[PDB]
């Protein structure tokens, strides 16, 4: 039975499960402009919600969706503003000190989005340039460290969410947008002129996405991991990948045209929660 102070206990006592979600993490957790929060990662959230309803024997359990940001996700998680979220949050050692993560659901490389006809081809070209990044992300940490350690004299602009960062680039307020490659492609898919943007540069890091939940809650993590494991090992995860990464997706019916890496296929065979950092 759920111990006091655990998430399942909180949900049962409050009579509702609070699902944190993203507004601009395409195509993981975002608004489809059809009144729904959708995406590859959100699909796991829905599966986890179903598992919770079953586990607690509450078929009519309330489900409340609350938007979160890269910057406020941990503080909101810690005071229980939301119970868990599946989106584009990187699982790393530092964050494990403040939260817990489910088995890995995606892997990304941190790169740059910039104009095709522009002069930015790699990270070295960013010296003395204006670069935008989303507040509270691993890319912001990496970019600031690179700026300091390599004395790049970059003017770093920190935006509230990925769409804001992209629009900063699109409107000429920055020459490049540094972020997880999948997210860069996601913002490009919503651009006024998608073809005008290229993802370039050597990845500054390889990062694993995991649904995030509160730390020291083994029972809720188990429920989430068990749900993820069945989705991945059954072949359902790949079907979700194809839907969100190989077919037209909202809100502009564009295609990500991504391919599932052999590494991801290996993980789907045997799910695990190892932080890549």
Q: Which is nearer to ligand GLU, 38 or 52 (CB)?
A: 38
Q: How far is the CB of 30 from ligand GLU (least distance, A)?
A: 11
**Which residues, 215 to 274, sit near ligand GLU by CB under 6 A?**
none
- Determine whether 176 is exposed, middle or buried from the number of CB atoms within 10 Å of its CB (0-12, 13-18, 19+): buried
**Which residues, 8 to 27, sit near ligand GLU by CB under 6 A?**
25
> Could you give the CA distance from residue 144 to residue 178 in angstroms, rounded to a whole number?
11
**Which residues, 65 to 84, sit near ligand GLU by CB under 6 A?**
70
Q: How far is the CB of 238 from ligand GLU (least distance, A)?
A: 21
- Angstrom CA distances, 178 to 40, 184, 201, 205, stand at 22, 8, 10, 12
88 binds ligand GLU (CB under 6 A): yes
**Which residues, 159 to 188, sit near ligand GLU by CB under 6 A?**
180, 183
The residues near 109 (Cβ < 8 Å, ≥ 6 apart) are 180, 181, 203, 204, 205, 206, 207
Q: Which is nearer to ligand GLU, 88 or 102 (CB)?
A: 88
Of the candidate residues 42, 102, 104, 138, the single one contacting ligand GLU (CB under 6 A): 138
90 binds ligand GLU (CB under 6 A): yes
> Could you give the CA distance from residue 246 to residue 240 in angstroms, rounded to a whole number?
10
- Angstrom CA distances, 139 to 53, 64, 204, stand at 36, 30, 8
Q: How big is the CA angle at 92 (ends 90 and 93), to the nearest 5 degrees?
A: 165
Q: How far is the CB of 62 from ligand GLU (least distance, A)?
A: 26
Q: How far is the CB of 211 from ligand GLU (least distance, A)?
A: 12
Judged by the rule CB under 6 A, the positions of this chain that interact with ligand GLU are: 25, 70, 88-90, 137-139, 180, 183, 207
């Amino acid at each position: 039975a759920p111990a006091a102070g655990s998430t399942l206990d909180k949900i049962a006592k409050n009579g509702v499960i609070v699902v944190g979600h993203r507004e601009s993490s395409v195509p993981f957790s975002y608004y489809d402009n059809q009144q729904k929060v959708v995406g590859y990662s959100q699909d796991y959230s829905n599966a986890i919600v179903e598992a919770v309803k079953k586990k607690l024997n509450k078929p009519d359990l309330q489900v409340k969706l609350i938007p979160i940001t890269s910057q406020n996700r941990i503080p909101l998680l810690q005071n229980g503003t939301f119970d868990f979220e599946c989106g584009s949050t990187t699982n790393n050692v530092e964050r494990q000190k403040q939260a817990a993560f489910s088995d890995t659901i995606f892997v990304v490389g941190t790169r740059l989005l910039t104009k095709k006809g522009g002069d930015i081809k790699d990270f070295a070209d960013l010296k003395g340039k204006a670069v935008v990044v989303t507040s509270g992300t691993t890319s912001e940490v990496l970019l600031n460290k690179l700026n300091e350690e390599q004395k790049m004299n970059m003017r770093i602009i920190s935006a509230k969410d990925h769409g804001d960062s992209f629009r900063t680039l699109e409107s000429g307020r920055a020459v490049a947008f540094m972020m997880d490659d999948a997210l860069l492609a996601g913002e490009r898919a919503k651009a006024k002129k998608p073809d005008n943007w290229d993802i370039v540069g050597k990845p500054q890091s390889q990062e694993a996405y995991g649904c995030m939940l509160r730390k020291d809650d083994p029972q809720f993590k188990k429920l989430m991991d068990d749900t993820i494991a069945q989705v991945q090992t059954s072949g359902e995860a790949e079907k979700w990948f194809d839907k969100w990464f190989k077919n037209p997706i909202p809100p502009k019916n564009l295609n990500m045209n991504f391919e599932l890496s052999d590494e991801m296929k290996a993980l789907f065979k045997e799910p695990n929660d190892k932080a890549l950092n």
